[PDB]
Design a protein around this ligand. Structure first.
Ligand SMILES: [Cl-]
Ligand SMILES: [Cl-]
Ligand code: NA
Ligand code: NA
Lengths: 320, 320
């Protein structure tokens, strides 16, 4: 992952286009005295931050001798972006990929993976995401060539963000970050950017966002919620809590409202978690102590993947 | 549009992220003795090459005094990417946008525009795209503040590709292009890149692609076809035919097959026209005279916009 000016050279493979994403000031929606900078992970080649984790898993596991193309089978339970990035990169790298997900998932979630030739294993609807996780573990337990991508525990996750996401942010902001805010899914983005920032001498406050309706890091009970991509309902092993200065809860409805406003104000088109992250950033930006300071957050995924979800239903309903 | 390393700076607005897109060698799908380079326009912020035309229209028309935010109303007939890019940029720039399209268009085509607050005017299904074009002209004729985006005639279209797309290609290929191939929609991409290449001293052969089922440039009759984004059924005023060395017809089914293969071979995920363009590139690449030469083509738009179209139906059917 050495820097590589995409705008001046021809890549030998699409995985060289992952990361080195743009950064963008929040402008019309930012009515505060603080700068808000959006790390545009929606601009990755398969349109989300999980492209960095997918690449890290194939790249680093192959380099360590743990994956062998044409022999290893990569397995994961995912109804979201990790599955997509695994299916995408697995195809070009010559791995069989198996993704498990409940039978009740939308046609779009299943069809996107099958485009890249992943095998999708549908689990009983009534068993929910737990039934998909169980099926993935059983597959890996039974077959010696089948390995779990292990997104919530893998050491590669925080590392890739430490090596790439965080240093890009550091360069883009000209070494000036007063607060870094990110919703925690696997915790990789938050943990790895916080490590890089700290090694650089930054005093940035590190803020983890989680859904108000599943406030686990806050000491509450796990619960179903709307903010796809964060709030896994347990504390993931990837996450290093020691680095977090503040856990901020954002309600699913504030995330949804914010995503809808962002498209029309700033032309940023994203999913629920980018709505939650910007809502959190604007909330921090309002605090009088943040006057003149620079807050960085992340836009994790591009909006087009959500057109069929509850995120844009208010527009769907209006359109009908 | 001066060069601006997105990977090292923070943009003040999302329209600074348009253009300066990556380029990528075709690898597993390329079994020839020629290099094939893909200009990745699917990596634009709203996921297609029309982001460059949208920006050119607002930017240049405002600079010339022809558009005034909050006064001018931008109007276009589009069931595709031009509407999206106009709706996107109009929102952030403070223009009312009206897009006309037949009533029979998918929920996704209508809902995407309404996300950016464009007004969508649905025209009678039986009148087809002609009825949408007529409604746009009538709106512009009747209202002095309403102006047509005029995608098929506007002088801004070839110009933006001459000023940006073509010079990026020239830098990325280290001033070495033996053939440039592009499907003609408005003709802007082909015309403007061919001009830039010629001004640079390139001897590249310029190849226009059109659908076999609507072979208008070839002297045939217009007809309905599958390859969304090209083959408008007339010769657009933007297109300068004098620059074209060869018109190559590609069948809709070859475009569809090629798009499906590209995802699994090279991880390139695009629409029908990127399928057609790569099919054409591989066809040229097979000619014995092209041994060791570099062919450039374009991937116009990202695949996610097509999940609901006939492009991926073979996977949709398999998934069901
Ligand atoms: Cl998101
Ligand atoms: Cl395309
Ligand atoms: Na992309
Ligand atoms: Na994008």
């Amino acid at each position: 992952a050495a820097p590589f000016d995409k705008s001046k050279n021809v890549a030998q493979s699409i995985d060289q286009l992952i990361g080195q994403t743009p950064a963008l000031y929040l402008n019309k929606l930012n009515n505060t005295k603080a700068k808000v900078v959006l790390k545009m992970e929606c601009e990755n080649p398969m349109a989300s931050v999980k492209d960095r984790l997918g690449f890290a898993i194939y790249d680093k596991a192959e380099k360590e001798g743990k994956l062998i193309p044409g022999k290893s089978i990569v397995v994961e339970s995912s109804s979201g972006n990790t599955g997509v990035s695994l299916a995408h990169l697995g195809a070009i790298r010559g791995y069989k990929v198996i993704i498990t997900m409940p039978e009740s998932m939308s046609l779009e979630r299943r069809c996107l993976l099958r485009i890249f030739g992943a095998e999708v294993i549908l689990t009983p609807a009534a068993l929910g995401m737990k039934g998909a996780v169980a099926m993935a573990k059983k597959i890996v337990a039974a077959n010696p060539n089948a390995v779990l991508a292990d997104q919530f525990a893998t050491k590669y996750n925080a590392l890739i963000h430490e090596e790439t996401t965080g240093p890009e942010i550091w360069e883009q902001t000209n070494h000036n970050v007063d607060c870094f805010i990110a919703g925690v899914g696997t915790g990789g983005t938050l943990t790895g950017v916080a490590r890089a920032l700290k090694k650089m001498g930054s005093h940035a406050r590190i803020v983890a966002v989680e859904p108000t309706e599943s406030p686990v890091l806050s000491g509450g009970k796990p619960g179903p919620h709307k903010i796809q991509g964060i709030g896994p309902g347990f504390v993931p092993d990837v996450l290093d809590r020691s680095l977090i200065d503040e856990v901020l809860c954002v309600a699913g409805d504030d995330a949804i409202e914010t995503a809808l406003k962002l498209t029309r104000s700033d032309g940023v088109f994203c999913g629920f978690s980018g709505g939650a992250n910007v809502y959190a950033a604007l909330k921090i930006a309002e605090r009088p102590e943040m006057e003149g300071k620079t807050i960085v957050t992340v836009i994790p995924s591009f909006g087009e993947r959500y057109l069929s979800t509850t995120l844009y239903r208010s527009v769907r309903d209006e359109v009908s």
